[PDB]
Amino acid sequence: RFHSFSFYELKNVTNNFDERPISVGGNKMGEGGFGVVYKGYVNNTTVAVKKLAAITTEELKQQFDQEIKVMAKCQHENLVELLGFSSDGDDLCLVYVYMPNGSLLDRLSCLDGTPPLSWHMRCKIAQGAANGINFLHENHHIHRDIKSANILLDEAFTAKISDFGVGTTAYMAPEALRGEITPKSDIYSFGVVLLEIITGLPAVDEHREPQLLLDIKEEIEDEEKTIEDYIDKKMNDADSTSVEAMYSVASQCLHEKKNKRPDIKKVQQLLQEMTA
Amino acid sequence: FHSFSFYELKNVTNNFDERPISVGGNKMGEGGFGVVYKGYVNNTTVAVKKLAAITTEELKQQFDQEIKVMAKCQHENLVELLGFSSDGDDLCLVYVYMPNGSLLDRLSCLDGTPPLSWHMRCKIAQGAANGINFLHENHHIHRDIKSANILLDEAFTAKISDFVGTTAYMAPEALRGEITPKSDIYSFGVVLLEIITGLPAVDEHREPQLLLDIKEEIEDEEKTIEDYIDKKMNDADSTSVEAMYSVASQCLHEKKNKRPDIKKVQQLLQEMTA
Numbered sequence A: 001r002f003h004s005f006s007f008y009e010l011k012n013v014t015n016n017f018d019e020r021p022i023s024v025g026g027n028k029m030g031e032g033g034f035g036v037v038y039k040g041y042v043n044n045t046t047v048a049v050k051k052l053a054a055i056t057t058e059e060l061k062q063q064f065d066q067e068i069k070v071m072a073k074c075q076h077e078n079l080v081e082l083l084g085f086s087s088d089g090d091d092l093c094l095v096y097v098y099m100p101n102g103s104l105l106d107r108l109s110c111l112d113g114t115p116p117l118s119w120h121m122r123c124k125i126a127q128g129a130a131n132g133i134n135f136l137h138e139n140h141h142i143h144r145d146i147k148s149a150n151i152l153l154d155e156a157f158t159a160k161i162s163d164f165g166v167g168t169t170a171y172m173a174p175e176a177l178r179g180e181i182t183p184k185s186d187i188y189s190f191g192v193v194l195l196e197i198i199t200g201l202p203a204v205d206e207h208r209e210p211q212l213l214l215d216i217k218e219e220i221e222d223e224e225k226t227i228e229d230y231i232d233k234k235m236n237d238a239d240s241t242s243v244e245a246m247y248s249v250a251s252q253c254l255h256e257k258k259n260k261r262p263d264i265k266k267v268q269q270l271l272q273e274m275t276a
Numbered sequence B: 001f002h003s004f005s006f007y008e009l010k011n012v013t014n015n016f017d018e019r020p021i022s023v024g025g026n027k028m029g030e031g032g033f034g035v036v037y038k039g040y041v042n043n044t045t046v047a048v049k050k051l052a053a054i055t056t057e058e059l060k061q062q063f064d065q066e067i068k069v070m071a072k073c074q075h076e077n078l079v080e081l082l083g084f085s086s087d088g089d090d091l092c093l094v095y096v097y098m099p100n101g102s103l104l105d106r107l108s109c110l111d112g113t114p115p116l117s118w119h120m121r122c123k124i125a126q127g128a129a130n131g132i133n134f135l136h137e138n139h140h141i142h143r144d145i146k147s148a149n150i151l152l153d154e155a156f157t158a159k160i161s162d163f164v165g166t167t168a169y170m171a172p173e174a175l176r177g178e179i180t181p182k183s184d185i186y187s188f189g190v191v192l193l194e195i196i197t198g199l200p201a202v203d204e205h206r207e208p209q210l211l212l213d214i215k216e217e218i219e220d221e222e223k224t225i226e227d228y229i230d231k232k233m234n235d236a237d238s239t240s241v242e243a244m245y246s247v248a249s250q251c252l253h254e255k256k257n258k259r260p261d262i263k264k265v266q267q268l269l270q271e272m273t274a
């Protein structure tokens, strides 16, 4: 299943856990979630290495085992993969396969000058994220934090659902803001994600009206606006038909009432008929 | 310049097909008192403004005034007027087509074009400043300086164009009716903010709605310029970004006599490039 790494290999491969950012040539790509994450290269693969730091050194462990426990079950083309771990001396380390095209969020915003995603590619990424969510649901997992920053992209730009360390309020369904734990909340957050894919806009912008992307649904329903007004201008290949089809899916996902939202298999089917 | 027969530009524009170019028509846009069409003649891709109805002979006077000013405005950084057509009706002005469109469209990455790098943006700023400087040396006030009026050729060389004012770009004294080149400087400062941020000059749904108001926020230290930098560049170092922001801040001074003149702006952008 998992390759058992030794802490000292992981130390050597991250260049002794170089803390300088990769933009400068170091190995540190991120922080947060009770650990720092470093780019490395092991077993002929570029990898992401999360080294856990120290609150209560036993709850760290708790989280360490939990992640391995859940990641063991979750293996799918459209999920991020846990290569292995190290329970070895000094620290705890988790090793994931590195996705070189980053998050869907960064590419939608064209961070660092990457070219804009085409509509074809956007459609395929939506289908893939839907498939990964479907795997999570079929096997009785709730993601509880679906967002564009939790969708990574590999060399081929295939969607890989991730969960970096109760959710993100700009993506949260009303019932989830009230404490309910259900997959239908995942479907709602995914509807927000589809709005991001269509518009290229972030989910929340404090300096924008509306501040929340989901509210554009209202503006379109009250016919103060239309979807064409919000289409990302950074594509030349987007046809009105399939854009409206994706918007329909997203709108159905964003129903305030959780039992009126489609399940993930329904979404899958609608996104299929979108490009069929 | 070249005198065209009206039927020639009619032939070359597909009889002034008014459908937009995206539909397969020839209409590039709506400017001044006429419509702008794409055409091709004499080994040159051209933009043809056909003027329409406003008193008719004042139309002819504007036509003649444009030919007179553009006839002796030939510069690397200005739009190049190729010719015209005055036989009967209508009046037509022919310019050389700029295939990379306007700075506004490229800053917004319209139709999926890649984002302009920081280096390219700096060279475009310098070129636009050179065009303004040419205009000002020859005692011309532009009166409508905006990113939509900065075109770009195959090499991304900035070309100033014109087709009163745009309120998101206007200096306070220009809003009160004054006519001075110092207003041009203020508008250029807005353009520089656009180049830094990728943001449009006005956004009705944004706080603030006017990009120029970010200066206040930065000066009132509610924010920093790094908060506003376009994310769509990987080559923007903090030093030269802050340098161009300084230039834009000086250009945006409310007191017209406290703004630098165009040559000082050229010097400052120059030093920014190092």
Ligand SMILES: Cc1ccc(C(=O)Nc2ccc(CN3CCN(C)CC3)c(C(F)(F)F)c2)cc1C#Cc1cnc2cccnn12
Pocket (backbone or CB within 6 Å): A029, A030, A037, A048, A049, A050, A067, A070, A071, A074, A079, A080, A096, A097, A098, A099, A100, A102, A136, A141, A142, A143, A144, A152, A161, A162, A163, A164, A165
């Ligand atoms: C450091 C790191 C830590 C954790 C995870 C991670 O995604 N863990 C994960 C945990 C649980 C679940 C499923 N559960 C969710 C909770 N829910 C309550 C139950 C179901 C899933 C899921 F993928 F399946 F979704 C993933 C990924 C990375 C990464 C990475 C990485 C790889 N390449 C790059 C390139 C740039 C940045 N990162 N990066």
Ligand SMILES: Cc1ccc(C(=O)Nc2ccc(CN3CCN(C)CC3)c(C(F)(F)F)c2)cc1C#Cc1cnc2cccnn12
Pocket (backbone or CB within 6 Å): B028, B036, B046, B047, B048, B049, B066, B069, B070, B073, B078, B079, B093, B095, B096, B097, B098, B099, B101, B102, B135, B140, B141, B142, B143, B151, B160, B161, B162, B163
């Ligand atoms: C059709 C057309 C007509 C006119 C002009 C035009 O800019 N005329 C102009 C007239 C006067 C002046 C001088 N100022 C003196 C002081 N006066 C108060 C203001 C005026 C200047 C100036 F360049 F010098 F600025 C320019 C450009 C075009 C174009 C075009 C074109 C070509 N390719 C493309 C690609 C995309 C979009 N457009 N486009």
Ligand SMILES: [Co+2]
Pocket (backbone or CB within 6 Å): A207
């Ligand atoms: Co604020």
Ligand SMILES: [Co+2]
Pocket (backbone or CB within 6 Å): B003, B004, B005
């Ligand atoms: Co001829």
Ligand SMILES: [Co+2]
Pocket (backbone or CB within 6 Å): B119
């Ligand atoms: Co350089």
Ligand SMILES: [Co+2]
Pocket (backbone or CB within 6 Å): B205
């Ligand atoms: Co509104």
